[PDB]
Amino acid sequence: KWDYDLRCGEYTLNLNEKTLIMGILNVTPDSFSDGGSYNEVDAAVRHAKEMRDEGAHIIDIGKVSVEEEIKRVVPMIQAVSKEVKLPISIDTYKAEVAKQAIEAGAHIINDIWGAKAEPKIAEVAAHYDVPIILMHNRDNMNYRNLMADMIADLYDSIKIAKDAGVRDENIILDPGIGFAKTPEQNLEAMRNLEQLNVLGYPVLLGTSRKSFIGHVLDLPVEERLEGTGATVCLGIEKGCEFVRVHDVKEMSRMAKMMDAMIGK
Amino acid sequence: KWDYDLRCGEYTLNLNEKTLIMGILNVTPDSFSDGGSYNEVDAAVRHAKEMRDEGAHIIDIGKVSVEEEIKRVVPMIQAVSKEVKLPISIDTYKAEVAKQAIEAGAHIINDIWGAKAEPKIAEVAAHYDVPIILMHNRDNMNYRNLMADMIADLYDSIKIAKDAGVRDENIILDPGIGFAKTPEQNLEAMRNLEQLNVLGYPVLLGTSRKSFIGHVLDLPVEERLEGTGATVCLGIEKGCEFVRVHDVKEMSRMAKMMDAMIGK
Numbered sequence: 001k002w003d004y005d006l007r008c009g010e011y012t013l014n015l016n017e018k019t020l021i022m023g024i025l026n027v028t029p030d031s032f033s034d035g036g037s038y039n040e041v042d043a044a045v046r047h048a049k050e051m052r053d054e055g056a057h058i059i060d061i062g063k064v065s066v067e068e069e070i071k072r073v074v075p076m077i078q079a080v081s082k083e084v085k086l087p088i089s090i091d092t093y094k095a096e097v098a099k100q101a102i103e104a105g106a107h108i109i110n111d112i113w114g115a116k117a118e119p120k121i122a123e124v125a126a127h128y129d130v131p132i133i134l135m136h137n138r139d140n141m142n143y144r145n146l147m148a149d150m151i152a153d154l155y156d157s158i159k160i161a162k163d164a165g166v167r168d169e170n171i172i173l174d175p176g177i178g179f180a181k182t183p184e185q186n187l188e189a190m191r192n193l194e195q196l197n198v199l200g201y202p203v204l205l206g207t208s209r210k211s212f213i214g215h216v217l218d219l220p221v222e223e224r225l226e227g228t229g230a231t232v233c234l235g236i237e238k239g240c241e242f243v244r245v246h247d248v249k250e251m252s253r254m255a256k257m258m259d260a261m262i263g264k
Numbered sequence: 265k266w267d268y269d270l271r272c273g274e275y276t277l278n279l280n281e282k283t284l285i286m287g288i289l290n291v292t293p294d295s296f297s298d299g300g301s302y303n304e305v306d307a308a309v310r311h312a313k314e315m316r317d318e319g320a321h322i323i324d325i326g327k328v329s330v331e332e333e334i335k336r337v338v339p340m341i342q343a344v345s346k347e348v349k350l351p352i353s354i355d356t357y358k359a360e361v362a363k364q365a366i367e368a369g370a371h372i373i374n375d376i377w378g379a380k381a382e383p384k385i386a387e388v389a390a391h392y393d394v395p396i397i398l399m400h401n402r403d404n405m406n407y408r409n410l411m412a413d414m415i416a417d418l419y420d421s422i423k424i425a426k427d428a429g430v431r432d433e434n435i436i437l438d439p440g441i442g443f444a445k446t447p448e449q450n451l452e453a454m455r456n457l458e459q460l461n462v463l464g465y466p467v468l469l470g471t472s473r474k475s476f477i478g479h480v481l482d483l484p485v486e487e488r489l490e491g492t493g494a495t496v497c498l499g500i501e502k503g504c505e506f507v508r509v510h511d512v513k514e515m516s517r518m519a520k521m522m523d524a525m526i527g528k
């Protein structure tokens with residue numbers, strides 16, 4: 001179906017073969033420090049290595065100053081990238097930040113403002129020639145038509161991407177769950193993911209432990225595994241490529257089961 | 265969508281409102297007895313009551329002699345029916361058995377040979393006027409066309425049903441996972457559940473902990489929760505009505521999440 005791979009440095013991800021799990025590195029902050037404390041990182045490396053072991057195929061590393069985020073995250077990318085043999089994605093909207101990460105050893109860029117926040121980002125994706133993820137997100141929540149608007153808004157991201165010079169191969173789409181959407185907006189979007197596909201790019205769907213699960217099911221964050229299940233399952237028969245989850249053990253076994261049913 | 269309810273004795277189930285969970289009562293046998301030992305039953309009642317508490321809306325009670333099955337199960341139906349305020353379904357292919365159960369207080373009849381095993385069953389459904397579940401199942405596994413054959417075979421069940429005099433309202437369909445199917449047959453059937461719907465009757469899908477999950481994922485029975493997840497999720501967006509599971513807590517939260525996504 002996809003005839004192209006996610007060439008990304010020393011690694012490459014194959015879209016046809018299986019659903020590709022992105023593991024959320026939870027960036028618990030050693031407050032007494034801004035930078036690479038031993039606990040801070042070890043703890044992070046401990047937790048990636050784990051996820052390596054859980055079936056996860058990429059690691060995600062999430063008003064605050066740039067400088068910090070750079071001292072925060074540049075010594076962290078650098079341990080894991082050097083310790084864990086998998087591609088590593090940065091979770092920033094900042095271009096000054098984007099650079100440093102990829103400079104550290106970061107692989108795929110994950111943006112929650114989809115080149116809108118700081119256009120300069122896209123240029124940097126161009127430059128180090130690396131996949132970027134664009135997310136739907138906005139600063140009000142007035143939609144004539146949820147989807148039609150999403151798909152619009154997504155499109156004015158791709159514009160900047162493609163204008164700055166990102167190859168189509170290096171572009172990924174994220175519907176951006178829990179951003180700028182009431183929890184009924186979130187549902188509808190889940191109901192109608194599949195129209196993200198007309199647009200001809202991989203979709204990554206991020207729903208682990210999200211507050212709409214708790215709106216429906218009425219159960220809080222540490223009891224949201226099952227919710228996350230369904231969103232990932234429906235997520236997938238609707239043809240999405242990556243899912244970005246916390247619970248790697250459990251979702252990884254849900255991916256593979258759907259992957260065998262829909263015959264992926 | 266359905267304009268009719270599952271009138272079933274003192275109870276009634278509404279098909280539009282939510283996915284309807286059937287809970288597997290696991291009939292651990294006090295071997296030193298054939299009949300209603302105190303442990304035997306208490307243990308059963310302990311476990312239904314639990315499932316009452318887990319979100320489950322019907323209780324399922326599964327070469328061996330009739331007489332036994334009757335002494336086995338007639339004092340058990342009778343506790344739970346009298347202790348747990350929900351509809352209760354019998355898991356037999358025998359008509360002599362069918363009677364006794366419903367006589368005890370049983371509600372909905374679950375058959376794994378779909379009126380084929382002992383046609384007389386269907387007559388009894390007629391007679392006590394109660395829903396019956398028909399399952400696809402056979403005694404070889406040669407199919408020209410999986411589906412087309414399933415759907416055929418299902419149809420020659422409905423024939424007996426409808427001939428003996430079962431109203432269409434009281435008929436339910438089960439694709440019969442892990443019966444007469446290689447684990448690739450099972451997958452394909454899951455892939456193409458939705459064609460069970462042309463036939464115009466509720467579908468109940470039974471996959472909890474089934475061996476095809478373990479063929480795919482390669483994990484045995486007590487590690488099969490996630491598998492069961494996906495089968496139930498995909499199960500449902502494909503428009504099935506009941507799922508018959510062991511893990512009521514967990515699947516019940518997967519039902520409700522899909523139920524909110526597909527807008528059911």
Ligand SMILES: Nc1nc2c(c(=O)[nH]1)N=C(CCNc1ccc(C(=O)O)cc1)CN2
Binds near residue numbers: 135207210
């Ligand atoms: N590409 C991508 N990046 C992300 C995402 C996401 O879904 N996709 N979510 C993230 C979670 C942070 N924001 C939220 C956290 C929770 C919720 C909610 O519970 O609804 C909504 C938003 C962070 N970064």
Ligand SMILES: Nc1nc2c(c(=O)[nH]1)N=C(CCNc1ccc(C(=O)O)cc1)CN2
Binds near residue numbers: 375397469473475476
């Ligand atoms: N209506 C209905 N009745 C049932 C079912 C079922 O799926 N639907 N399964 C049952 C499980 C018993 N048989 C099997 C048990 C395990 C497996 C397997 O692991 O593949 C296959 C079959 C018993 N009764």
